[PDB]
Design an enzyme around this catalytic site. Structure first.
Site, PDB file in Angstrom:
ATOM      1  N   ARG A  38       0.807  -1.221   0.000  1.00  0.00           N
ATOM      2  CA  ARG A  38       0.000   0.000   0.000  1.00  0.00           C
ATOM      3  C   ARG A  38       0.842   1.275   0.000  1.00  0.00           C
ATOM      4  O   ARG A  38       0.403   2.317  -0.495  1.00  0.00           O
ATOM      5  CB  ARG A  38      -0.938   0.017   1.209  1.00  0.00           C
ATOM      6  CG  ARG A  38      -2.134  -0.906   1.099  1.00  0.00           C
ATOM      7  CD  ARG A  38      -2.869  -0.962   2.427  1.00  0.00           C
ATOM      8  NE  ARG A  38      -3.833  -2.056   2.473  1.00  0.00           N
ATOM      9  CZ  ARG A  38      -5.131  -1.902   2.712  1.00  0.00           C
ATOM     10  NH1 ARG A  38      -5.630  -0.692   2.930  1.00  0.00           N
ATOM     11  NH2 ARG A  38      -5.931  -2.960   2.738  1.00  0.00           N
ATOM     12  N   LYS A 215     -21.838 -16.080   0.963  1.00  0.00           N
ATOM     13  CA  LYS A 215     -23.261 -15.752   1.050  1.00  0.00           C
ATOM     14  C   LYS A 215     -23.934 -15.234  -0.215  1.00  0.00           C
ATOM     15  O   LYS A 215     -23.280 -14.775  -1.148  1.00  0.00           O
ATOM     16  CB  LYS A 215     -23.506 -14.745   2.181  1.00  0.00           C
ATOM     17  CG  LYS A 215     -22.261 -14.034   2.686  1.00  0.00           C
ATOM     18  N   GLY A 373     -10.314  -7.037  -1.909  1.00  0.00           N
ATOM     19  CA  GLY A 373     -10.514  -8.124  -0.966  1.00  0.00           C
ATOM     20  C   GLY A 373      -9.892  -9.452  -1.363  1.00  0.00           C
ATOM     21  O   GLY A 373      -8.831  -9.495  -1.990  1.00  0.00           O
ATOM     22  N   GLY A 396     -14.615  -3.293  -0.100  1.00  0.00           N
ATOM     23  CA  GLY A 396     -15.957  -2.787   0.134  1.00  0.00           C
ATOM     24  C   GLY A 396     -16.372  -1.648  -0.781  1.00  0.00           C
ATOM     25  O   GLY A 396     -17.500  -1.615  -1.258  1.00  0.00           O
TER      26      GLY A 396
HETATM   27  N1  LIG Z   1     -17.705 -23.537  -1.235  1.00  0.00           N
HETATM   28  C1  LIG Z   1     -17.414 -22.763  -0.194  1.00  0.00           C
HETATM   29  N2  LIG Z   1     -17.821 -23.108   1.060  1.00  0.00           N
HETATM   30  C2  LIG Z   1     -17.516 -22.316   2.099  1.00  0.00           C
HETATM   31  N3  LIG Z   1     -16.817 -21.159   2.076  1.00  0.00           N
HETATM   32  C3  LIG Z   1     -16.418 -20.835   0.783  1.00  0.00           C
HETATM   33  C4  LIG Z   1     -16.671 -21.561  -0.366  1.00  0.00           C
HETATM   34  N4  LIG Z   1     -16.128 -20.953  -1.482  1.00  0.00           N
HETATM   35  C5  LIG Z   1     -15.573 -19.897  -0.986  1.00  0.00           C
HETATM   36  N5  LIG Z   1     -15.699 -19.751   0.378  1.00  0.00           N
HETATM   37  C6  LIG Z   1     -15.171 -18.665   1.256  1.00  0.00           C
HETATM   38  O1  LIG Z   1     -15.795 -17.427   0.943  1.00  0.00           O
HETATM   39  C7  LIG Z   1     -14.963 -16.366   1.478  1.00  0.00           C
HETATM   40  C8  LIG Z   1     -15.250 -15.152   0.661  1.00  0.00           C
HETATM   41  O2  LIG Z   1     -16.603 -14.723   0.898  1.00  0.00           O
HETATM   42  P1  LIG Z   1     -17.044 -13.351   0.644  1.00  0.00           P
HETATM   43  O3  LIG Z   1     -16.658 -12.946  -0.691  1.00  0.00           O
HETATM   44  O4  LIG Z   1     -18.462 -13.276   1.019  1.00  0.00           O
HETATM   45  O5  LIG Z   1     -16.193 -12.630   1.735  1.00  0.00           O
HETATM   46  P2  LIG Z   1     -15.929 -11.074   2.299  1.00  0.00           P
HETATM   47  O6  LIG Z   1     -17.245 -10.504   2.530  1.00  0.00           O
HETATM   48  O7  LIG Z   1     -14.991 -10.341   1.515  1.00  0.00           O
HETATM   49  O8  LIG Z   1     -15.292 -11.411   3.716  1.00  0.00           O
HETATM   50  P3  LIG Z   1     -15.841 -12.347   4.887  1.00  0.00           P
HETATM   51  O9  LIG Z   1     -15.597 -13.754   4.438  1.00  0.00           O
HETATM   52  O10 LIG Z   1     -15.013 -11.870   6.013  1.00  0.00           O
HETATM   53  O11 LIG Z   1     -17.289 -11.996   4.975  1.00  0.00           O
HETATM   54  C9  LIG Z   1     -13.553 -16.880   1.341  1.00  0.00           C
HETATM   55  O12 LIG Z   1     -12.857 -16.677   2.582  1.00  0.00           O
HETATM   56  C10 LIG Z   1     -13.697 -18.337   0.959  1.00  0.00           C
HETATM   57  O13 LIG Z   1     -12.908 -19.228   1.738  1.00  0.00           O
END
Ligand SMILES: Nc1ncnc2c1ncn2[C@@H]1O[C@H](COP(=O)(O)OP(=O)(O)OP(=O)(O)O)[C@@H](O)[C@H]1O
Ligand SMILES: [Mg+2]
Length: 416
Positions: A38, A215, A373, A396
């Site tokens: 950074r 999610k 991220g 974000g």
């Molecule tokens: N099939 C899966 N089952 C469970 N977790 C998964 C799967 N594929 C990816 N992930 C997890 O999803 C995460 C990324 O999720 P997402 O993009 O929602 O995260 P973020 O909002 O940036 O951060 P956080 O995970 O802290 O909410 C990664 O850490 C990854 O390990």
């Protein structure tokens, strides 16, 4: 519109004091910086000023989460001033505060070509507008204090420059409270605006969006907005199990399931259909008996289903084949979220293979954009940050842009 904001190259710094907001929120293993990326990314903007005659360059940033209370023993920017001097090959005056008569005096008429680094902006509750006291209680900033904090910062220079895209999505004092005639985006901000204007304004075709993550409910607006711009969309990661279970009645064992998102699934596919968007979902997966790095591994397809007490942590080979076909046809790509648990090697291959395809696509003229991220982290882990078109500096903030929101910090910048 994102292309109509003032940038550093179109700003006359000659003989002017420059107040610049940068992103120095580097990771620290204690009192040592574990990653100086950074700081390096910011040098081009600082050097441009110094080389074009600026009288001085005042740097302000935040680090960690002091929460509006001074904590110099944990989140001080002193270590950064040291790393800065070695990288810029110039002396850096570090001040123990970011506002006040003593700081304003030191910034009034600095020795020409001076580089000044102010102390953590978040040591003051007025920067975020809210914070927490030592008791752990939640305190809200006083409007009168906020005004004096902002007027102070505004006296530290003549022109304002913002190179902290990662904070642009927040209406913090350092983002929207510096009252100066011209406010330009730095070179890091410039790259973010140009590439996302391509993702949201005039994109190349076909335009593919690769969406992953865990999610679904929290990415509803993102998916919704992207369906209004893309021609194709890959839905991977743990997110896809909610879709597969709802549309195919697939058995998903202990894989992530988003209850709320499951009720919106068919409505998302309907919009896709109405827009002519082709959706690509995984067809096979790499399973695990527990959510752990050293877990026992297996395989499954949509037809076979996932066994009870087992979870899909990555897409399988056939899904990688289909993903790569999607990438083959794209002339523009926006990738946000891994398609698997990339933090664990045994479940990072689907993501590594896709990266390899996107790197190859870039070589032949595809515009490849990676979101901040995790995705952005995947680039550093396998050294591909310079193998794609753009890797966003803000997770974000980049997510709010793709959702279609107006960023407070971007909006505060001058037009034309
Ligand atoms: N099939 C899966 N089952 C469970 N977790 C998964 C799967 N594929 C990816 N992930 C997890 O999803 C995460 C990324 O999720 P997402 O993009 O929602 O995260 P973020 O909002 O940036 O951060 P956080 O995970 O802290 O909410 C990664 O850490 C990854 O390990
Ligand atoms: Mg999150």
């Amino acid at each position: 519109s994102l292309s109509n904001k003032l940038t550093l190259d179109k700003l006359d710094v000659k003989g002017k004091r420059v107040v610049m907001r940068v992103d120095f929120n580097v990771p620290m293993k204690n009192n040592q910086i574990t990653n100086n990326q950074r700081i390096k990314a910011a040098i081009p903007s600082i050097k441009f000023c110094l080389d074009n005659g600026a009288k001085s360059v005042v740097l302000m940033s935040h680090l960690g989460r002091p929460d509006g209370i001074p904590m110099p023993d944990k989140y001080s920017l002193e270590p950064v001033a040291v790393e800065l001097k070695s990288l810029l090959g110039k002396d850096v005056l570090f001040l123990k505060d970011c506002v006040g008569p003593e700081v304003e005096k030191a910034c009034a008429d600095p020795a020409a070509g001076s580089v000044i680094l102010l102390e953590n902006l978040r040591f003051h509750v007025e920067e975020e507008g809210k914070g927490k006291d030592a008791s752990g209680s939640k305190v809200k900033a006083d409007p009168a204090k906020i005004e004096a904090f902002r007027a102070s910062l505004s006296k530290l220079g003549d022109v304002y420059v913002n190179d902290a895209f990662g904070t642009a999505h927040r209406a913090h004092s350092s983002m929207v409270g510096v009252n100066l005639p011209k406010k330009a985006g730095g070179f890091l901000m410039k790259k973010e605006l140009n590439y996302f204007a391509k993702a949201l304004e005039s994109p190349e075709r076909p335009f593919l969006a690769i969406l992953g993550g865990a999610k679904v409910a929290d990415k509803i607006q993102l998916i919704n907005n992207m369906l209004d711009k893309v021609n194709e969309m890959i839905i991977g990661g743990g997110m896809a199990f909610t879709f597969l279970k709802v549309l195919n009645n697939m058995e998903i064992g202990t894989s992530l399931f988003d209850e709320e998102g499951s009720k919106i699934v068919k409505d998302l596919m309907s919009k896709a259909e109405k827009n002519g968007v082709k959706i690509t979902l995984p067809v096979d997966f790499v399973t695990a008996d527990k959510f752990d790095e050293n877990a026992k591994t297996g395989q499954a397809t949509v037809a076979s289903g996932i066994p009870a007490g087992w979870m899909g942590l990555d897409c399988g080979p056939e899904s990688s084949k289909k993903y790569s076909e999607a990438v083959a046809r794209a002339k523009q790509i926006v990738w946000n979220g891994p398609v698997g648990v990339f933090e664990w090697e045994a479940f990072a291959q689907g993501t590594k293979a896709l990266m390899d395809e996107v790197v190859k696509a870039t070589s032949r003229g595809c515009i490849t954009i990676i979101g901040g991220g995790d995705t952005a982290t995947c680039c550093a882990k396998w050294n591909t940050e310079d193998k794609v078109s753009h890797v966003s500096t803000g997770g974000g903030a980049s997510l709010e842009l793709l959702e279609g929101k107006v960023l407070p910090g971007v909006d505060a910048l001058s037009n034309v």
